[PDB]
């Protein structure tokens, strides 16, 4: 009476282990545990989304509007929330686009599932309901698609691609940020029209180097690349035309020492006199074959000796440090050189082509530039990103990664296959999925119905973040789709969507003239991985933890 | 089921800070206003300085937005935005670092009551980002395309708010000559490297056409060499001139004892052969990054050849550009043409420290002055004041743009913003006018430190812009307000553009934030 | 969910609460079932103060030992209500609740709801009452035969002590209810018998006394211990004044008034005692072999003992409250408080009164009454624990023989009713079902749970329970076809079936009533319990 028996036969397992079954409203608590961090994602979707401060134990801060990025640093206790972390991590790695959606959709599927489990629907039927809804959802995304790119390189078409992507992360001004990406995409692409070759594009080609100071308007697009290096011997503006040559060596510019106990041995004074001059003549003789080929800059892979440096700057050969593997490989793609570890003569076919190598003051420190010209184009271009706050450089840099990741979406599938944005793609599926529930019989119809209700969060979120009342903006938009397709062809009610700024009522003046669209490849895997996030959380009825 | 407790699963870790509510973003603004209060009275020439002592008991005296926030280890996340823009403004321009901070804090302090109202975050950011585009274009019209009259006036204003402002009559005459030695498109900052000399008075400084570096070591034959050469010749070395191992190894087998005497004499033979090649070319001054042994310096000491060592690579690079020579890491490849020359040489006693002076070159790329002072903070303040002024006259050569100082730029931009807000769109009229009066914080505090009443000043500025078209600003000497063009006070426009862009970027960064997460 | 309301709370729900209820019942069963039957073991309740006590009744074992588990508290409270109203059968209650929860939990694990299981117990309980009222037998107690009361008392007292002490003590129980009887009013009081704790020769040397025995002796030596004819006189007011209710004080004017005011208190003592002396010589003056004893509840003045000592008056003091009712029943007197009215009619009578000096105290023995309506039992023993052991034996044996007079019906023991009730609760054809395939699960569980009583007796004796019950099963198979009503039992000496009526083992009717009713109710409510909780403010 004074004390319970405190759960007998509990010594089967350790004291730290705990069980968590579906009963006792614990599945409702797991939905509430998702609801804690899901509401943090509400104020971070859209162009009016607000970034987030995350102070780690080390003190490294990253300020951001992207889900997949923010969830990396937060240490999570609940395992069901970690499914959303790895689900968004999969979204960032594969497609690099549509991570908030993975978070906001899969969290709302668990929200509407709170009503379904409370009604009395078995968990097995819930998974069958969303799977049958998923097959119809992915089917209709291919049907209501409009428009295509059909050209890899164009000035006006890239404005339709990059601009709606970076509009979520650090909107700012539209033109100054979009032109930096569309100019850099055209440099790296192998155009090669009327040849029948397979296109190819690498995410690691376009890379952004962060430099403090300046303003966002002063950002330029560099053909080549840049490091924060200092030439050792001398600096040269290189005002001499008639382009220079480039030779890349991965080994250090020094005498190849013996790997096993390299030690001097001098038996008599005759070897003592010649050993000091032998190293000078040997290093000089190797530079003669290198210098006669007309090379004026050599990129070293490791530490360079002083004696080798004395003969390099004699003939005015520039030295560059790249003490890492990937930093040396990225530079060969610009000039198109084939490195060889030997210290002999570079082959003439393997020598690279760089016209000028300038050294100027940008951020107060010494930097080396490798700008090419219109002739003999190169790939793996960089973007000089100027800003005042280092935290803003980090989020804008990842926005270029999201934009570069969106360019990857054009290579693998047959084309662009753009969709209407601004909630139009979500609100259209609500009517189609609702009609699909009426066609199918059985107790799964409520699962199909709640699956459509979960898609309202995109227009509800954009209306809440835009400082508008969602009770008036949302049903005003339903009137455009409650007047369904009459007998006249070429109906233009599909482009109606929400609006962040402007006219009252809100149905946007089309997403058309506005030139904002969404990618099909992002919506396919996002709805697939979001449904898998809700499937794995709803399919499990018992959870076991340890130590907490 | 495995335990009677059944602990409730917390979402985040234990100890994580709080979350959404009322007052989260307001605390970040109040945190910035707190840091902004410390840098508030340091504005203008009639301001003050801030004394800080960190945990390591290192005393420092300064009035620079970058230096004050650098020593203070700021742990608050939103407050470090002011640290970033100060370093960003200090790294590029090097002046007005404060005017960037006391301005961003006013925009965030002015955004405080709008956030208390039902105004969203994006509406406030759209106002500043649309207004700053017109401020940059308006400053281009305020700035002039001046080319006539051929530096002197720009340096006097950059030295304000710190020590050498009153001594501008002597320091500006030689500071203008520092950048004229540098040619176009190079602008090397390491050539303007200046060192510390604890001891002396700042008035006894002088201009030097070359370098002056500390020896940092007393050699055995240092006094034997002459201190005065009429026609010296400089040659830079890199080989180590002493008896030691040759190339990173030491192993010598000897079988016969007769050859054991010869191998030792060979080492004595080659080391003098290494020194004799330096002697035959007539190099009077010898310099090397690596140490120089007692054997070499005594060989040079007999026949009147000065030598020195224990110098850094940054100092060596300044020696080459001053004398116009080159680096030679081998004694056999020495030729007469690569030797640098100057007018004369004289080692002088400076603060109980010896310095090797070079001066009188026909073409010198280097300006390096010795900073002597009483305390270690006096020589430090003279360095930072010159380092901020030298950047202004440096970039003045890059482009010739001049705007009126004394808070005159903020008032002229604010009047057109009030006209632009009066015309259109209704809703943003409050935001732009709020940005207008918030932009006037620079002349606001500039007169409060002077002891004058702000109401009589600010009422005189607004109603007198018609005849004071653009060059209308404050004057501290006559205790009145007049035209700044007659007073010859000038300031470039690059401080103004980077200040508004950095301040607009700073306030818009955390204005798009309504959260704070702190693990552990 | 409960942690959100109170973090310091706990809850076991729907599988952990069921194991707690069954394991606590089986744990209470495994410890306390060993006392069942004559071959049971003795327990030593050794508390922190070193008090030793031997007993086999489950009531006093659970009363001294505080119960920590919440389930066993409910079973201990059931044994309290069983021992309170009846005073026997506590070991059968805990075994039935333990077996009912065991047999029920066997079916709950098979996927059966607890509701229909408890519904079958109630129908099985009501079916047992329709079996019990036909199974009982009626006897005529007007003859007041001693042989039937002895063997009925021997059946109850064999489960407390060994055989040789039971034969000595079993006439003491039958002698307790000799004169206490009323045919018309049907009133029979159990508290009139007086249990005295004293150390004497041995437990096996006790004896029955017809009259009353008080624990108070004569204070003065001069009064005679032997009195051949005594007239009792009941007093209740204190002859020695303890305190005056109204505050007062004797303020004397001079030294001569000091002894007079001391004599003022002597007058009020002599005033009420003069009527006592006048009461003595009113009957007959100078009558040898005729004493006069006084029994007072409150104290007596030691100054007044000299007055009682001169006239040879036995005076006792500090008597008990319940003894005032016992004096008039034994001696035939009349209770009085004051001394205003006195007469020889109100006085009782006694044939022999004597005292004995045992240790540092003296016990008054009043015997040889004409028609006493009460008696007493001296609990002699060789120690402290034998007094409590024999006291519990008499207090448990008085109820078994007293119920024979309260209701003439009596059930044969030796597990006869539990064995016979098992077959009757096998197949309820169309009598009382209520539903198809639902109630019958509880009928089977209730029938199998009742047969643990005869098996527990065999486990204490040290034989196999299934073997000795097989011949009992084979006996009753042919008894129905032989056309002869026969009751079978369980003999623990040889391990073979037997006849209770022939040998002499019986059980009271009210024991099996409250035991089955109390066990079925507690077994039902514990099965209905699906969650245990705790909450409060420390
Ligand atoms: N200016 C705008 N007007 C209307 N809708 C917009 C605008 N900018 C963005 N959107 C919509 O907001 C949605 C936000 O998508 P989001 O998940 O933030 O993309 P990302 O994966 O790059 O984070 C887009 O799908 C788009 O349709
Ligand atoms: N001679 C002067 N007369 C009037 N105002 C001046 C003068 N020199 C500087 N100022 C004002 O002082 C302000 C701050 O400049 P300065 O002291 O150089 O840097 P900081 O912003 O670090 O204090 C400028 O906005 C400028 O208008
Ligand atoms: N001599 C005996 N032989 C067989 N059974 C007995 C004997 N004495 C008692 N019993 C059985 O023991 C049961 C309980 O009797 P008893 O021990 O007196 O009560 P309690 O168990 O409460 O102490 C009775 O139902 C009876 O059938
Ligand atoms: Mg996007
Ligand atoms: Mg300044
Ligand atoms: Mg009994």
Swiss-Prot record, chain A:
Cell location: Cytoplasm
Cross-link (Glycyl lysine isopeptide (Lys-Gly) (interchain with G-Cter in ubiquitin)): 14
Phosphoserine carried by residues: 504
GO MF term list: ATP binding; ATP hydrolysis activity; ATP-dependent protein folding chaperone; unfolded protein binding
GO cellular component: chaperonin-containing T-complex; cytoplasm
Coiled coil: none
Assembly: Heterooligomeric complex of about 850 to 900 kDa that forms two stacked rings, 12 to 16 nm in diameter.
Biological function: Molecular chaperone; assists the folding of proteins upon ATP hydrolysis. Known to play a role, in vitro, in the folding of actin and tubulin. In yeast may play a role in mitotic spindle formation.
Annotated family: Belongs to the TCP-1 chaperonin family.
Protein name: T-complex protein 1 subunit theta
Taxonomic lineage from the root: Eukaryota, Fungi, Dikarya, Ascomycota, Saccharomycotina
Gene that this sequence comes from: CCT8
UniProtKB/Swiss-Prot annotation, chain B:
Gene Ontology biological-process annotations: chaperone mediated protein folding independent of cofactor; protein folding
Pfam families: Cpn60_TCP1
NCBIfam families xrefs: chap_CCT_eta, thermosome_alpha, thermosome_beta
UniProt function note: Molecular chaperone; assists the folding of proteins upon ATP hydrolysis. Known to play a role, in vitro, in the folding of actin and tubulin. In yeast may play a role in mitotic spindle formation.
Keyword Chaperone: yes
InterPro entries, alphabetized: Chap_CCT_eta, Chaperone_TCP-1, Chaperonin_TCP-1_CS, Cpn60/GroEL/TCP-1, GroEL-like_apical_dom_sf, GROEL-like_equatorial_sf, TCP-1-like_intermed_sf, TCP-1_chaperonin
Record keywords, A-Z: ATP-binding, Chaperone, Cytoplasm, Nucleotide-binding
This protein's encoding gene: CCT7
Top-level taxonomic group: Eukaryota
Organism: Saccharomyces cerevisiae (strain ATCC 204508 / S288c) (Baker's yeast)
Chief place where the protein resides: cytoplasm
KW Transcription (keyword) present: no
Annotated localization: Cytoplasm
Molecular functions per Gene Ontology: ATP binding; ATP hydrolysis activity; ATP-dependent protein folding chaperone; unfolded protein binding
Assembly information from the UniProt record: Heterooligomeric complex of about 850 to 900 kDa that forms two stacked rings, 12 to 16 nm in diameter.
Record protein name field: T-complex protein 1 subunit eta
Swiss-Prot record, chain C:
A Pfam family recorded for this sequence: Cpn60_TCP1
This protein's UniProt keywords: Acetylation, ATP-binding, Chaperone, Cytoplasm, Nucleotide-binding, Phosphoprotein
Localization of this protein: Cytoplasm
GO molecular function, a single term: ATP binding
Residue positions where Phosphoserine is found in the record: 248
One Gene Ontology cellular component annotation held by this UniProt entry: chaperonin-containing T-complex
CDD domains: TCP1_zeta
Highest taxon, organism lineage: Eukaryota
Cysteine pairings via disulfide bonds: none
Residues with the N-acetylserine modification: 1
GO biological process: chaperone mediated protein folding independent of cofactor; protein folding
SUBUNIT field: Heterooligomeric complex of about 850 to 900 kDa that forms two stacked rings, 12 to 16 nm in diameter.
Function per UniProt: Molecular chaperone; assists the folding of proteins upon ATP hydrolysis. Known to play a role, in vitro, in the folding of actin and tubulin. In yeast may play a role in mitotic spindle formation.
Similarity comment: Belongs to the TCP-1 chaperonin family.
Protein name: T-complex protein 1 subunit zeta
Organism: Saccharomyces cerevisiae (strain ATCC 204508 / S288c) (Baker's yeast)
């Amino acid at each position: 009476s004074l004390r319970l028996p405190q759960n007998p036969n509990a010594g089967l397992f350790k004291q730290g282990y705990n069980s968590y079954s579906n009963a006792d409203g614990q599945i409702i608590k797991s939905i509430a545990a998702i609801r804690e961090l899901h509401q943090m994602c509400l104020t971070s979707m859209g162009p009016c989304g607000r970034n987030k401060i995350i102070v780690n134990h080390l003190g490294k801060i990253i300020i951001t509007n992207d889900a997949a990025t923010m969830l990396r640093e937060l240490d999570i206790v609940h395992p069901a929330v970690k499914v959303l972390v790895m689900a968004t991590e999969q979204q960032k790695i594969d497609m690099g686009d549509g991570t908030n959606l993975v978070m906001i959709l899969a969290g709302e599927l668990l929200n509407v599932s709170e009503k379904l489990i409370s009604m009395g629907l078995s968990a097995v039927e819930i998974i069958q309901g969303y799977n049958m809804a998923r097959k119809f959802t992915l089917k209709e995304l291919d049907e209501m698609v409009v428009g295509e790119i059909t050209d890899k390189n164009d000035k006006n078409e890239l404005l339709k691609m990059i601009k709606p992507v970076i509009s979520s992360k650090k909107y700012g001004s539209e033109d100054i940020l979009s032109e930096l990406v569309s100019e850099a995409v055209s440099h790296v692409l192998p155009v090669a029209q009327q040849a029948g070759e397979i296109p190819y594009f690498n995410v690691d080609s376009i890379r952004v180097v962060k430099i403090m100071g300046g303003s966002l308007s002063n950002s330029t697009v560099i053909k080549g690349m840049v490091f924060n290096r200092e030439p050792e011997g001398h600096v040269k503006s290189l005002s001499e035309d008639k382009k220079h040559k480039v030779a890349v060596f991965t080994c250090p510019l020094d005498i190849a020492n013996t790997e096993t106990k390299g030690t001097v041995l001098l038996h008599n004074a005759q070897e003592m006199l010649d050993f000091s001059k032998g190293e000078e003549k040997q290093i000089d003789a190797m530079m003669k074959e290198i210098a006669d080929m007309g090379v004026e800059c050599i990129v070293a892979g490791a530490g360079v000796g002083e004696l080798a440096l004395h003969y390099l700057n004699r003939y005015g050969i520039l030295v560059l440090k790249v003490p890492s593997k990937f930093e040396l490989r990225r530079l060969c793609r610009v000039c198109g050189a084939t490195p060889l570890p030997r210290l002999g003569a570079p082959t003439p076919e393997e020598l690279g082509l760089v016209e000028t190598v300038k050294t100027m003051e940008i951020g107060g420190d010494r930097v080396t530039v490798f700008k090419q010209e219109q002739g003999e184009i190169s790939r793996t271009s960089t973007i000089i990103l100027r800003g005042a706050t280092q935290n803003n450089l980090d989020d804008i840099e990842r926005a270029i990664d999201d934009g570069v990741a969106a360019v990857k979406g054009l290579m693998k599938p047959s084309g662009g296959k753009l969709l209407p944005g601004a909630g139009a793609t979500e609100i259209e599926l609500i009517s189609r999925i609702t009609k699909y529930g009426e066609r199918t019989p059985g107790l799964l119809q409520l699962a199909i119905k709640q699956f459509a209700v979960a898609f309202e969060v995109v227009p509800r979120t954009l209306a809440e973040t835009a400082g508008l009342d969602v009770n008036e903006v949302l049903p005003n938009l339903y009137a455009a789709h409650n007047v369904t397709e009459p007998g006249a062809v070429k109906t233009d009610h599909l482009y109606k969507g929400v609006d962040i700024d402007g006219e009252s009522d809100e149905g946007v003046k089309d997403i058309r003239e506005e030139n904002i669209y969404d990618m099909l490849a992002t919506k396919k895997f996002a709805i697939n991985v979001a449904t898998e996030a809700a499937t794995t959380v709803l399919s499990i009825d018992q959870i076991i933890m340890a130590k907490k | 089921n495995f335990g009677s407790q059944t602990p409730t699963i917390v979402v985040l870790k234990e100890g994580t800070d709080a979350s959404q509510g009322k007052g989260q973003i307001i605390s970040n603004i109040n945190a910035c206003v707190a840091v902004q209060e410390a840098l508030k009275p340091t504005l203008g020439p009639l301001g003050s300085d801030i004394l800080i002592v960190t945990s390591n008991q290192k005393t420092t005296i300064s009035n620079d937005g970058a230096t004050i926030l650098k020593l203070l280890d700021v742990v608050h996340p939103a407050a470090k935005t002011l640290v970033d823009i100060s370093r960003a403004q200090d790294a590029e321009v090097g002046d007005g670092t404060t005017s960037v901070t006391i301005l961003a804090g006013e925009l965030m302090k002015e955004a405080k009551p709008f956030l208390e109202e039902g105004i969203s975050s994006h509406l406030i950011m759209k106002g500043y980002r649309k207004a700053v585009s017109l401020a940059v274009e308006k400053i281009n019209e305020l700035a002039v395309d001046i080319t006539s009259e051929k530096l002197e006036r720009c340096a006097r204003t950059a030295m304000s708010s710190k020590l050498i402002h009153n001594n501008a009559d002597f320091f500006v005459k030689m500071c203008v000559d520092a950048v004229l030695s540098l040619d176009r498109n190079d602008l090397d900052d390491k050539l303007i490297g200046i060192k510390k000399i604890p001891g002396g008075a700042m008035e006894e400084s002088l201009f030097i056409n070359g370098v002056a570096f500390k020896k940092t070591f007393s050699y055995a034959g240092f006094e034997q060499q002459p201190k005065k050469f009429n026609n010296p010749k400089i040659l830079s070395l890199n080989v180590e001139l002493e008896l030691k191992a040759e190339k990173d190894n030491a192993e010598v087998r000897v079988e016969h004892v007769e050859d054991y005497q010869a191998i030792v004499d060979a080492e004595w033979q080659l080391i003098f052969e290494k020194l004799r090649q330096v002697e035959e070319t007539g190099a009077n001054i010898v310099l090397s990054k690596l140490p120089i042994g007692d054997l070499a310096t005594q060989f040079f000491a007999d026949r009147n050849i000065f030598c020195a060592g224990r110098v850094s690579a940054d100092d060596m690079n300044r020696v080459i550009q001053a004398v116009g020579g080159s680096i030679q890491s081998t004694t056999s490849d020495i030729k007469p043409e690569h030797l640098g020359t100057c007018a004369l040489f004289e080692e002088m006693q400076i603060g109980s420290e010896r310095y090797n002076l070079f001066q009188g070159c026909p073409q010198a790329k280097t300006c390096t002055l010795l900073l002597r002072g009483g305390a270690e903070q006096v020589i430090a303040e003279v360095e930072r004041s010159l380092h901020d002024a030298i950047m202004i006259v440096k970039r003045a050569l890059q482009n010739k743009l001049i705007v009126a100082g004394g808070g005159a730029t903020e008032m002229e931009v604010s009047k057109c913003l009030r006209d632009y807000s009066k015309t259109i769109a209704g809703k943003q009229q409050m935001i732009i006018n709020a940005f207008a009066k918030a932009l006037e914080v620079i002349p606001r505090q500039l007169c409060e430190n002077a002891g004058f009443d702000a109401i009589e000043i600010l009422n005189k500025l607004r109603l007198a812009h018609s005849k004071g078209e653009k060059w209308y600003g404050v004057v501290f000497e006559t205790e009145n307000i007049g035209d700044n063009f007659a007073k010859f006070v000038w300031e470039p426009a690059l401080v103004k553009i980077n200040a508004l862009n950095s301040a607009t970027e700073a306030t818009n960064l955390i204005l798009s934030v309504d959260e704070t997460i702190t693990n552990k | 969910s409960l942690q959100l309301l109170n973090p310091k709370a706990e809850s076991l729900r729907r599988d952990a609460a069921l194991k707690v209820n069954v394991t606590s019942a089986e744990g209470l069963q495994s410890v306390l079932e060993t006392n069942l039957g004559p071959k049971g073991t003795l327990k030593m309740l050794v508390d922190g103060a070193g008090n030793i006590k031997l007993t086999k009744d489950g009531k006093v074992l659970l009363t001294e030992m505080q119960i920590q588990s919440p389930t066993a508290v409910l079973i201990a409270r059931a044994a309290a209500a069983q021992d309170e109203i009846t005073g026997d059968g506590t070991t059968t209650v805990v075994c039935l609740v333990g077996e009912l929860l065991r047999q029920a939990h066997r079916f709950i694990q098979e996927g059966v709801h607890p509701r229909i299981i408890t519904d079958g117990f109630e129908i099985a309980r009501k079916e047992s009452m329709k079996f019990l009222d036909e199974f009982k037998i009626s006897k005529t107690n007007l003859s007041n035969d001693r042989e039937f009361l002895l063997q009925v008392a021997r059946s109850s007292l064999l489960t407390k002590v060994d055989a040789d002490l039971t034969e000595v003590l079993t006439p003491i129980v039958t002698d307790a209810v000799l004169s206490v009887y009323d045919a018309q009013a049907d009133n029979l009081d159990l508290h009139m018998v007086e249990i005295m704790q004293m150390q004497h020769l041995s437990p096996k040397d006790t004896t029955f006394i017809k009259g009353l025995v008080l624990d108070h002796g004569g204070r003065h030596p001069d009064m005679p211990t032997r009195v051949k004819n005594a007239y009792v006189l009941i007093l209740n007011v204190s002859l020695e004044y303890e305190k005056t209710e109204v505050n007062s004080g004797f303020f004397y004017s001079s030294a001569d008034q000091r002894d007079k005011l001391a004599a003022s208190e002597r007058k009020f003592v002599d005033a009420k005692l003069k009527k006592i002396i006048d009461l003595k010589n009113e009957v007959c003056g100078m009558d040898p072999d005729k004493g006069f004893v006084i029994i007072n509840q409150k104290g007596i003045d030691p100054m007044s003992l000299d007055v009682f000592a001169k006239h040879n008056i036995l005076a006792l003091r500090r008597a008990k409250r319940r003894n005032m009712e016992r004096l008039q029943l034994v001696t035939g007197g009349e209770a009085q408080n004051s001394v205003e009215d006195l007469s020889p009619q109100i006085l009782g009578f006694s044939g022999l009164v004597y005292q004995e000096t045992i240790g540092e105290e003296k016990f008054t023995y009043v015997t040889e009454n004409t028609d006493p309506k009460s008696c007493t039992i001296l609990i002699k023993g060789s120690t402290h624990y034998a007094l409590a052991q024999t006291k519990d034996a008499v207090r448990d044996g008085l109820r078994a023989v007293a119920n024979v007079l309260k209701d003439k019906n009596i059930i044969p023991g030796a597990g006869a009713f539990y064995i016979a009730l098992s077959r009757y609760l096998r197949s309820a054809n169309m009598n009382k079902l209520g539903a198809k395939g639902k109630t019958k699960t509880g009928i089977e569980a209730f029938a199998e749970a009742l047969l643990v009583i005869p098996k527990t007796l065999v486990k204490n004796s040290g034989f196999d329970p299934l073997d000795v019950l097989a011949m009992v099963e084979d006996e009753l198979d042919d008894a129905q076809d032989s056309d002869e009503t026969r009751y079978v039992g369980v003999d623990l000496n040889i391990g073979d079936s037997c006849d209770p009526t022939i040998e002499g083992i019986w059980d009271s009717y009210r024991v099996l009533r409250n035991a089955i009713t109390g066990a079925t109710g507690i077994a039902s409510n514990l099965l209905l319990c699906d969650e245990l909780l705790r909450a409060g403010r420390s």
